[PDB]
Amino acid sequence: AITVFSPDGHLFQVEYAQEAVKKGSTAVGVRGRDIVVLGVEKKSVAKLQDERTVRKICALDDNVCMAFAGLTADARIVINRARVECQSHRLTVEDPVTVEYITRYIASLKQRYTQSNGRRPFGISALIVGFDFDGTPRLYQTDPSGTYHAWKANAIGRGAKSVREFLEKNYTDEAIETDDLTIKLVIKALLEVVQSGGKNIELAVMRRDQSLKILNPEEIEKYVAEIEKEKEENEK
Amino acid sequence: MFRNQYDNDVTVWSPQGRIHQIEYAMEAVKQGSATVGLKSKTHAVLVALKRAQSELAAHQKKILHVDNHIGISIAGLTADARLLCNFMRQECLDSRFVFDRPLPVSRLVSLIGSKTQIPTQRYGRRPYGVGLLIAGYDDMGPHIFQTCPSANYFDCRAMSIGARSQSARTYLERHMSEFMECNLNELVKHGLRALRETLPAEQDLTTKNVSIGIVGKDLEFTIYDDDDVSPFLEGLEER
């Protein structure tokens, strides 16, 4: 049954939901000086499918973005609830929401489903980025148990540990000097687990006082080629 | 071997005509420390023992105050003890606040038994896992009562419950013929001597592991703890 503790002090359903999350596609987020970058790799591509309806990056509001990894229907439900909450907050308080506010709402909603026997946990993880009113970039993570934190760079899904080690080794204050350097860092981190190159990379960026922007395959290929050429130049 | 199918729910009769969950719940009383209760012609005394751990980590309330003429001692589950104490306090307060007269101890015990019998027959519920000793004074004199998780209550001249209380029970049975004529000092001495029988052969009573509650004629219920038990402890002889 739901809400049953393991002999060592674990909830079975939460662990199983995390196991389900572990099978999702890899997502990477990096916080820069004046830009935030999100990147999700494509597990498989079908030529008969429309790419607009299978996107894993969504905009909650004018200054908040979100990426997920796990089940898709639950993610859609969570995204719809977050959008409605943002709209209601704007309408009533006539002020824009904050990244911490929306993250706390999502975390509380996730936690409320681990309490009763008539419900089951969600089973998704989310990365939330954006800009506050004062102009401070933010980055948060949430898990099915309801825990949230603040990060400088993080990854979820398959290869999350390897990408986290790469980001820990390669993240410096001199590597986020410019937007191009930040994008190159995100692409390099995501390429550590993708073997087919830049053809399975979905990338989106957000700048201060600007809306969400999605990079085209031509730009992705140009960035990948530049990174590669720098690689052979370093290798001599 | 054949008990597997019939010992998981409280609403299932065994083919032998038994309910095992009630017995399992009654087995939970022996998880707490021992308590001793005895009465005389004019007084009723409760004596309790505290856990051997240090007092820094936790302060234990073994003897509780219910009314000006009723006090109880507990052994078992803390949540059940709290629930029963709140119920008894509400009953006594309602009686006083409405009718301007004290509530009889027998009536209170009957109400407690009636309340505790209910969860032993419904599905998805469990019996209470606490045992109580009740001492009170009313128009009929001193009283000592014992309550069981099986919703059974008894009228006692002296009783002991808790872990390893058989030796205390044996001492009380042996020395029960002289409790009626004793005064307060000798009654408390007898209670302490009975409680001492549940300890190893080398340990001794100390002011930091003994609690005393006294009710009687022209004396409201009072709890003595820490340095207040020194006058009662003085005068005891070597084992």
């Binding site: 049954a1 503790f5 393991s6 060592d8 936690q111 009763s116 760079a153 | 071997m1 803390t78």
Partner: protein
């Protein structure tokens, strides 16, 4: 003379043959996965110290709050699952603020304790609706405040009831911390001595190095209000060691 399987740890309303509640015992065992916290109360105030463990250099230390302020005279320290304590903290804050707003006095620590403990025991209630909490909370708390009765310290576990104490340690290193506290605590000690002893014990039990960034400290005094130490004060106190 056959060995067969038998289990009694499936529900919260099942007694074992020896009279135990295994689900509640497992909920209590869940606290061993948290960090270590220490609370000491003296005749001059209550001192609370907690350890926060950062699992990666990319994490933000300021995003971990393990000591909160319930009111101007009550503080709390958590250990276990931080997501579970949010409801209890909100309930305590609402109760205290409502009482002040209505009557213009302050609630007692015991009253706030009872209000919090009513919610933590929702499982096992007589007529609790199925849509509410159905399992014990997987978190332990340490309440400390100053009332007209003087400084007070309380402890709660997933069992659901509070117990008063003088010096208590919770978390993974609770055994060693309590063993160290036993030979240090005495009734005539002061707040500065309590702070120094708690910091020494925390340094002894922590696997990492004490560097005034991975710990938190707060005190409550009858004269002043709840106060949380800053980086400069933490460095000044630590440099004494």
């Amino acid at each position: 003379m056959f060995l067969t399987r038998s289990e009694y740890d499936r529900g919260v309303n099942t007694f074992s043959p020896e009279g135990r509640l295994f689900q509640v015992e497992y909920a209590i065992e869940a606290i061993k996965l948290g960090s270590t916290a220490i609370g000491i109360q003296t005749s001059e105030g209550v001192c609370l110290a907690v350890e926060k463990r950062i699992t990666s250099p990319l994490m933000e230390p300021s995003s971990i709050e393990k000591i909160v302020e319930i009111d101007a005279h009550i503080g709390c320290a958590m250990s276990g699952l931080i997501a579970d304590a949010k409801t209890l903290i909100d309930k305590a804050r609402v109760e205290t603020q409502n009482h002040w707003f209505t009557y213009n006095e302050t609630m007692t620590v015991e009253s706030v304790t009872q209000a919090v403990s009513n919610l933590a025991l929702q499982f096992g209630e007589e007529d609790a609706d199925p849509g509410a909490m159905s399992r014990p909370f997987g978190v332990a708390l340490l309440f400390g405040g100053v009332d007209e009765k003087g400084p007070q310290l309380f402890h709660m576990d997933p069992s659901g009831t509070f117990v008063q104490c003088d010096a208590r340690a919770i978390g993974s290193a609770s055994e060693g911390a309590q063993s160290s506290l036993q030979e240090v605590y005495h009734k005539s000690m002061t707040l500065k001595e309590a702070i120094k002893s708690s910091l020494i014990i925390l340094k002894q039990v922590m696997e990492e190095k004490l560097n005034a960034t991975n710990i938190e400290l707060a005190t409550v005094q009858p004269g002043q209000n709840f106060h949380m130490f800053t980086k400069e004060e933490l460095e000044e106190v630590i440099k004494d060691i």
